Ligand binder design. Structure first.
Ligand SMILES: [Zn+2]
Lengths: 345, 48, 158, 158, 341
């Protein structure tokens, strides 16, 4: 039906069925996640397999079948045969190393478990970064990504609990997202804080003048290197775009884009130009000596805009010689039979 | 050039449409005498 | 297998407690459980329209008017599919065509105001979510959050 | 741009049908920019609404599913439809094409029953439970004896 | 209308911001200078304001010029932006109560109570006798008597004095089970509305359809009470059906409307049929009203933000900038003169 309620109910229901106890459950899971790490590494040590591979195979066996490996990541790990071979060596690990295998999986499991339980935490956080320009679900989602980030770095040895830790790692993920996706035209985090500062400043300035500050105040109040050109620019970038498709004029049936003209396209007038221009330019180019005429025709009209570097083997003196003598004979007879005079431009 | 005007090429309303249509799953392909392709988008749709 | 997924006999899950040699063996089996276009993509590929055509033919003229009427309307779609044109596994979307660029312009208005076809805000919607999805799978995947997104994703595709 | 490349290695009409060595651009004017198509590769599929929400669900019709409600049910949220086989029971055999809820679904893949009841104090229920918990198969309705009555109403081990 | 902002409790309050005198006087620039230069000829306005405290102290920050409101030329036209503009009058149903014939069933006609502004109920009384009567505020219908009971009209005094001459009285005394408990009927109707609300709310929602907001502050005397005494019912105690002195409400309007429906349906008390298009029903909005309404809309937008700042300001010096922000009133009134259709 309507999307917010369903997810809210979705995880709130599962937290309702499994909140994590303050100390015990979070400690429990934490301890297991870490042991997983120490496990996987020792596994790489004895298998010679990259901890990335050992990590992905324990993931498959605990989080999903061939289905989850084939669609998400296209196909480098053979759906069946590949992952299985990897599990066989894990089995071969005697009593000593087999232990790490069994731990890795159980660890991985705990991980996901700690992640489920602290989803209300995200939503509670994400709840306040609402009207920034991101959908609540998008916001919760990035924040979620943030909590997963936290899980990777939490050191349970250092007594502080995951609550306070997740907060930071989530708030960071969100704010980033808000700064990277919120607009149509990307704007770096610096420009963002800059705009917030700009905004906040305009607020304190609205406070007493009764005059929406000229870009003079803003420069001042802002600080060290602020000037009118700077603020006029920033607020020009702050205005989000408009809709090429918006209800226009009297709101009846008016769509905004019919009004904007076009520039690259040669309005007939231009197509006719290029026709005479090229035919006449082409007639002259042939009646001349190819030597320095083509040099300048090609050097200028074929690739890019170098007198010396323009002529093949013959030096500058023959260039200027024929360039300026052919260019003038060409111009002066074109003066006689006036075809070019009428500036095609 | 005083040329008897040329014989019409495909209208952009048509091409705008086909693509609008392609934007949605649907595939609209024009056909030949015998049910075979023909080409509206002159040479810009074949790839690379 | 260690203590997640292991199918021995009719009982199909196996937990392990190296304390006492205890091989915990939970009893439920491979239940193909799916939700979302994934589940329907499957369903759609598996059907041999010829079979359902013939099946409906019989259902059409033989039983009374209630279930045979439903079968006539259901035979319409199946027939055309088979008749001429293309086959039905395509109704599912896994590859989203993107409309050209100049048709969804980005233009310079006034002051430096810019103007873009509303289509581009929707496209970014899809792309960001599609991407966020990929990174969410990779990072590790808590179910609720994956669906949550797949939901948004779907909606976006609409 | 008109006939020119992005970088400019090749810039006029003579080689009109070839692409640039270091960067890719075959040219005729910016019209190619407005006629060409790009595509987004979806993570996990989704479906066309043009086919799913037209009055006759072209997919609900072809796939005998609840023409209008079974779709909406599994499509946008998590209501599962057993696709190929699922040996274990609900009370009856595996539902070839029928749909089930998260709850009952949950009850299926981990084990029949999940009962985590953890005691209030340190000596009253911690003793009742422990004594009968480790190797003793606890039958349904095992009446643990101390806070209120710790009731274990389900199956096999503890 | 919107100045006495009473904000009492959720944390600390007892806020009382009061209006003294409204004064506007020195135009920024003049007419022709307003046309040569792009300028909106508007007079400056700042009224006197003094906010009270529950602690000893009342800070009076005299002026705050919010809202530059356009002026009228001696001919009657304005000067908004470069071009002289004009505000055209309008027409509509003058907020009253009428009885129009029923939609499809040729049978009998139904009653309508019209309360403008928009926010503010829209009542209708219809009887479909196989077992139901219909009175609708937002949409779903309920009993015409459960309400009179609430107010204090009991089955006996009601039925005999009002409809002795009106047999329809029988539909009124019908569900006696609920008519036998007074104030409990108040809680019962509350229950009839639907959220899943606290049964206990002493006299809160009854107030809303009682004295202040929804019914209207259109001048006490001739605004609505004209449509009353001549068309139906004789008196009004308090502008619209209004009272908050004892917790027990008075409704000299709820009974007369039914009184006239029993009357309209039963003969000639007079001939009670209202031709809507009678101009005594369709009213003309002169310029003033059109501006006063946008001015008040802005006043609410202003008073909305100010409430937030009765909590934001640290201690007592919160009179000037802490309570007033000229952003709303400007955009609001400005929008009416330049963008109003
Ligand atoms: Zn290039």
């Amino acid at each position: 039906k309507i999307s917010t309620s369903d997810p809210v109910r979705q995880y709130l229901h599962e937290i309702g069925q499994v909140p994590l106890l303050t100390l015990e459950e979070e400690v429990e899971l934490a301890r297991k996640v870490e042991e997983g790490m120490e496990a996987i590494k020792k596994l790489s040590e004895i298998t010679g397999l990259d901890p990335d591979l050992i990590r992905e195979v324990v993931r498959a066996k605990i989080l999903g079948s061939a289905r989850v490996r084939h669609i998400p990541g296209l196909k480098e790990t053979l759906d069946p045969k590949t992952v299985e071979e990897i599990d066989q060596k894990l089995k071969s690990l005697p009593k000593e190393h087999k232990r790490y295998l069994h731990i890795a999986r159980e660890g991985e499991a705990a991980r996901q478990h700690l992640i489920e339980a602290n989803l209300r935490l995200v939503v509670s956080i994400a709840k306040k970064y609402t009207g920034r320009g991101l959908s609540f679900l998008d916001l919760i989602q990035e924040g979620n990504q943030g909590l997963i980030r936290a899980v990777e770095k939490f050191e349970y040895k250092r007594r502080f609990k995951f609550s306070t830790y997740a907060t930071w790692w989530i708030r960071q993920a969100i704010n980033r997202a808000i700064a990277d996706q919120a607009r149509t035209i990307r704007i770096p985090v610096h420009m963002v804080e800059t705009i917030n500062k700009l905004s906040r400043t305009a607020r304190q300035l609205q406070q007493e003048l009764g005059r929406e500050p000229t870009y003079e105040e803003i420069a001042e109040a802002m600080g060290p290197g602020w000037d009118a050109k700077r603020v006029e620019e920033t607020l020009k970038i702050a205005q989000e775009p408009v809709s090429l498709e918006t209800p226009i004029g009297d709101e009846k049936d008016s769509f905004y884009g019919d009004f904007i003209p076009d520039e690259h396209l040669p309005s007939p007038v231009d197509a006719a130009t290029q026709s005479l221009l090229s035919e006449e330019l082409e007639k002259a180019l042939s009646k001349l000596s190819e030597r320095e005429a083509m040099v300048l025709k090609l050097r200028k009209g074929l690739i890019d805009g170098e007198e010396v570097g323009a002529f093949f083997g013959v030096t500058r003196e023959r260039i200027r010689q024929i360039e300026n003598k052919a260019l003038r004979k060409l111009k002066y007879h074109e003066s006689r039979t006036r075809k070019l005079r009428d500036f095609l431009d | 050039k005083g040329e008897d005007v040329p014989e019409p090429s495909v209208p952009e309303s048509f091409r705008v449409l086909v693509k609008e249509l392609q934007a949605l799953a649907l595939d609209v392909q024009t056909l030949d005498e015998k049910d075979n392709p023909v080409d509206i988008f002159e040479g810009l749709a074949s790839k690379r | 297998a260690d203590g997640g997924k292991v199918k021995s006999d009719v009982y199909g899950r196996v937990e392990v407690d190296l304390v006492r040699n205890v091989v915990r063996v939970v009893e439920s089996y491979d239940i193909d459980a799916r939700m979302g276009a994934e589940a329907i993509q499957q369903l759609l590929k598996e059907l041999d329209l010829e079979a359902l055509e013939k099946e409906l033919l019989e259902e059409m003229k033989h039983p009374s008017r209630a279930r045979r009427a439903k079968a006539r309307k259901r035979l319409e779609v199946v027939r055309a599919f088979l008749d001429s044109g293309n086959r039905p596994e395509w109704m599912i979307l896994e590859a989203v065509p993107v409309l050209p660029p100049d048709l969804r312009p980005m233009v310079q208005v006034d002051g430096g105001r810019f103007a873009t076809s509303d289509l581009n805000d929707l496209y970014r919607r899809l792309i960001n979510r599609n991407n966020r999805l990929k990174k969410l799978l990779a990072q590790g995947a808590p179910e609720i959050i994956i669906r949550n997104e797949k939901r948004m994703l779907q909606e976006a595709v609409d | 741009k008109d006939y020119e490349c992005a970088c400019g290695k090749y810039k006029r009409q003579r080689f009109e049908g070839k692409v640039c060595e270091r960067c890719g651009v075959e040219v005729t004017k910016s019209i190619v920019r407005r006629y060409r198509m790009g595509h987004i590769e979806l993570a996990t599929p989704a479906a066309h609404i043009w086919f799913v929400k037209d009055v006759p669900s072209k997919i609900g019709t072809l796939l005998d599913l609840s023409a209008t409600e079974l779709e909406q049910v599994l499509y946008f949220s998590k209501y599962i439809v057993l696709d190929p086989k699922g040996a274990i029971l609900n009370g009856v055999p595996v539902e070839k094409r029928q749909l089930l809820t998260d709850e009952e679904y949950r009850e299926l893949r981990y084990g029949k029953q999940e009962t985590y009841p953890l005691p209030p104090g340190v000596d009253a229920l911690v003793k009742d439970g422990e004594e009968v918990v480790k190797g003793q198969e606890l039958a349904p309705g095992v009446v643990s004896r101390l806070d209120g009555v710790a009731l274990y109403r389900f199956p096999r081990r503890v | 209308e919107t100045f006495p902002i009473e904000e009492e409790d959720k944390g600390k309050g007892g806020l009382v911001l009061d209006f003294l005198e409204y004064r506007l006087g020195e135009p920024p620039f003049p007419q022709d200078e307003c046309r040569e230069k792009d300028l909106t000829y508007q007079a400056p306005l700042y009224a006197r304001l003094q906010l009270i405290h529950k602690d000893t102290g009342l800070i009076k920050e005299d002026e705050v010029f919010l809202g530059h409101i356009p002026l009228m030329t001696e001919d009657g036209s304005f000067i908004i932006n470069g071009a002289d503009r004009v505000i055209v009058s309008q027409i509509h149903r003058s907020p009253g109560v009428y009885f129009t014939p029923d939609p499809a069933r040729p049978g009998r006609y139904i009653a309508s109570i019209i309360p403008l502004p928009k926010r503010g109920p829209w009542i209708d009384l219809e009887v479909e006798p196989n077992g139901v009567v219909s009175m609708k505020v937002n949409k779903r219908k309920f009993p015409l008597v459960l309400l009179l009971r609430v107010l204090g009209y009991d089955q006996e005094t009601l039925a005999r004095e009002l409809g002795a001459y009106g047999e329809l009285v029988q539909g009124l005394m019908d569900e006696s089970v609920f008519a036998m408990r007074p104030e409990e009927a108040l809680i019962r109707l509350f229950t009839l509305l639907r959220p899943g609300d606290p049964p206990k709310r002493d006299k809160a929602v009854a107030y809303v359809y009682g004295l202040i907001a929804d019914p209207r502050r259109y001048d006490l005397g001739e605004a609505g009470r004209y449509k009353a005494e001549e068309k139906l019912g004789i008196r009004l105690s308090g502008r619209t059906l209004a009272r908050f002195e004892d917790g027990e409400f008075k409704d000299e309007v709820f009974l007369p409307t039914l009184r006239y429906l029993f009357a309209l349906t039963a003969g000639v008390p007079g001939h009670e049929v209202d031709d809507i298009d009678h101009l005594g029903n369709r009213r003309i909005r002169t310029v003033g009203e059109l501006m006063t309404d946008q001015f008040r809309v802005g006043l609410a937008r202003l008073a909305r933000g100010v409430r937030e700042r009765m909590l934001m300001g640290s201690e007592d010096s919160l009179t000037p900038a802490k309570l007033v922000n000229s952003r709303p009133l400007e955009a609001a009134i400005r929008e009416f003169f330049s963008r109003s259709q």
